[PDB]
Amino acid sequence: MEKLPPGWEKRMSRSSGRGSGMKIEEGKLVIWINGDKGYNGLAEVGKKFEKDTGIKVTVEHPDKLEEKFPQVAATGDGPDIIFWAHDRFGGYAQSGLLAEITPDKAFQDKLYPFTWDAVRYNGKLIAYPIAVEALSLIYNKDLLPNPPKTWEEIPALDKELKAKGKSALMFNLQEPYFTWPLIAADGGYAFKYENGKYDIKDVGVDNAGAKAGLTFLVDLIKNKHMNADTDYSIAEAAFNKGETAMTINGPWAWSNIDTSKVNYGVTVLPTFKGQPSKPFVGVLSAGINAASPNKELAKEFLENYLLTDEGLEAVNKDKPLGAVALKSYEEELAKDPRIAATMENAQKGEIMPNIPQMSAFWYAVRTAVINAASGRQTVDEALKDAQ
Ligand SMILES: OC[C@H]1O[C@H](O[C@H]2[C@H](O)[C@@H](O)[C@@H](O)O[C@@H]2CO)[C@H](O)[C@@H](O)[C@@H]1O
């Protein structure tokens, strides 16, 4: 084995009552999914399940559910099913919070092999794969018929649009997920992937490539092309109201842009130092709470209602999922240019590790970016800390 991620002391404080029966309600399904996803669409699938079974399906979307789940599940409470990108699930699994899932070989053949890989932890399947998420460059086609192919061009493009009372680019600077594609472009990485194994001793958050990418970000801010305060909501409002020509976001965001006046394109992220931006790619996945008394219901719901063409379509019509893991539905989606873009950024990026250390990693990088962007620390100082 390998050294446990930080916080064993705290996980042990949650020990009492863990398995000593604390109740999730038997005879229904409670599901957690992030509020940016198609949770209404998911609830519709839930209604279909209820019609066929008499089993009520309740979908909730609490803020910070990826942090709340291990807190509530460790005591044996929480949702029956938790949706999040696969990167959090190895930590959950190592804490004992997830049931191993048991799809037969027939079912497994309906999803792409690499998506099962993403939800396999220490040789065992610990969640159902749903969709493949990659960030793309989203741009206003009226403001910008030809989107920039490089990060390097964006300051000049900004000067251009500033003269027209617009700006070039706004995206969420508070979550490192969104700046990671730039940090990784010139060689930053999380953990060294050697011989099919992640080396937790070899972290690349402060190598030359990481520093170059983060420095480019902070220079954008220094030069008033971006603002360190910009978050998800600010950037989205600004793009969807036509004040900024570009944003960086995932497929879930398209629905809101659709309802806007903006005629937009979805495309490949620009290069940095001549190399592709490398988004960390997530597989939206559904795990079954180890403490759930409804595991067979959860299985049935996920395999026979959600992971179907009609199930994923209900969710997708609410908020687009991206490239889905279900082969039959993905062949249909693959024709959308926006999904093509999603797929290109996905293959240029890297499927996130699911190892238990990912939570600590993201927290470290989150702090590093925020501190460097605000000017509280220098790029070198901030990244040195993260290592
Ligand atoms: O920023 C750190 C954060 O990145 C990823 O979270 C994504 C998630 O994958 C997407 O589904 C979407 O909801 O946006 C999130 C970023 O705000 C990781 O999956 C997550 O563990 C990590 O903390």
The answer to whether the beta carbons of residues 342 and 267 sit under 8 Å apart is no
Which residues are CB-contacts of 379 (< 8 A; sequence separation ≥ 6)? 211, 214, 215, 218, 372
Q: Which atom of ligand 1 is nearest to the CA of 86?
A: 19
Helix (DSSP H) and strand (DSSP E) numbers for the chain: 17, 16
Rg (CA), the chain: 21
368 lines ligand 1 (CB under 6 A): no
> Terminus-to-terminus CA distance in the chain, angstroms?
22
- Residue 131 CA to residue 373 CA, distance in Å, equals 31
Query: Which among 34, 177, 357 is the best mutation to test ligand 1's pocket, defined by most ligand atoms within 8 Å of the CB?
Result: 177
Q: Which DSSP string corresponds to 263-299?
A: -EEEEPPPBBTTB---PEEEEEEEEEETT-S-HHHHH
Q: What's the token pair of residue 203?
A: 């972290």
Q: Which atom of ligand 1 is nearest to the CA of 172?
A: 17
Q: What's the token pair of residue 202?
A: 């070899």
DSSP bridge partners of 189: 204
- Residue 344 CA to residue 368 CA, distance in Å, equals 28
b/e sequence 69-86, b meaning 16+ C-beta within 10 Å: bbebbbbbebbbbbbbbb
- Residue 70 CA to residue 97 CA, distance in Å, equals 7
How many angstroms is it from 325 CA to the middle of ligand 1? 18
- Residue 210 CA to residue 188 CA, distance in Å, equals 4
Q: Reduce the DSSP state of residue 367 to 3 states and report it.
A: helix
**Residue type at position 132:** V
The answer to whether the beta carbons of residues 280 and 180 sit under 8 Å apart is yes
How many angstroms is it from 34 CA to the middle of ligand 1? 10
How many angstroms is it from 372 CA to the middle of ligand 1? 20
176 lines ligand 1 (CB under 6 A): yes
160 lines ligand 1 (CB under 6 A): no
Greatest extent of the chain over all pairs of C-alpha atoms, in Å: 65
Burial (CB count <10 Å: 0-12, 13-18, 19+), residue 310: exposed
- Residue 292 CA to residue 134 CA, distance in Å, equals 31
